[PDB]
Design a protein around this ligand. Sequence first.
Ligand SMILES: COc1cc2ncnc(Oc3ccc(NC(=O)Cn4cc(C(C)C)nn4)cc3)c2cc1OC
Length: 298
Amino acid sequence: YSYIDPTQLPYDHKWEFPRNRLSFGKTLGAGAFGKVVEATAQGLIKSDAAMTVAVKMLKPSAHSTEREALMSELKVLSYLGNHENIVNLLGACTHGGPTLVITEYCCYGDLLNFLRRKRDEFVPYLYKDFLTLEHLLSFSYQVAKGMAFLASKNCIHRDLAARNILLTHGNITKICDFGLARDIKNDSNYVDKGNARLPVKWMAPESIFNSVYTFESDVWSYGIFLWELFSLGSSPYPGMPVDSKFYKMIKEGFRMSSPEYAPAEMYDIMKTCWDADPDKRPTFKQIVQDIEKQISES
Ligand SMILES: COc1cc2ncnc(Oc3ccc(NC(=O)Cn4cc(C(C)C)nn4)cc3)c2cc1OC
């Protein structure tokens, strides 16, 4: 929810695709109630050529709440329309069986696992495809541009992190949301807080203590994502478990020091994203303008 009720958004039937034209392959990811599988779609291209796609669907374990949530995701994707910095909708199957959501396939997978795999060969300054500082600045710019677009459409992400960014051809990043297709019960980055399992280390104080999610709380998460990026995939608040001492320290103003590979101007952005006053944080549009200047000066 937040600013817009996703259940009231319309679904354009121009997206309707016949489900008998899909051939399912390997499961890319699974949670308790949902999954994402790799598939071949036939007749999606005007010229009889087959194409590889990603398909999100529910498991027989899912209930009415999860069935409403997958339909709401489809309505939001149809409402947003395509954007270069967001995973794009290609089609959907809404009759003749369970809901299927068809999105573009991203050959390099999630950004978190890519950074961890590339960590040991990082170059701060050719066939080998080494990760450089130039690539980290470009990723930070592309993610801020996609988030500036979501905010302009009155959308709040609520789970922005490196694990929710995909990487495709030509070092292009795409904002995504695995949601129900992530096993949050066995992921240590999600913590038990009341009757929920939440990503506390990425959450703004107003979201933790008041359950308030806004344009400003997404900006706090972006600052945490920057720390993950310039630490080459390390977990935030290293050596600190999520306990009473953690919630106390955050309220009292404790903040992480800069990661090892962050330029000083990128750490300056992180600090402003983590201001206790939501009105003192920059907008995603201001972040884009700031990074643009850094890239041009480089
Ligand atoms: C080679 O490995 C992979 C390739 C992949 N290629 C493509 N997709 C993959 O997974 C998916 C991840 C997420 C989604 N769904 C959404 O993001 C829908 N959405 C967007 C939003 C917001 C508006 C931003 N809200 N909801 C669909 C598929 C892959 C996973 C891989 O490995 C794990």
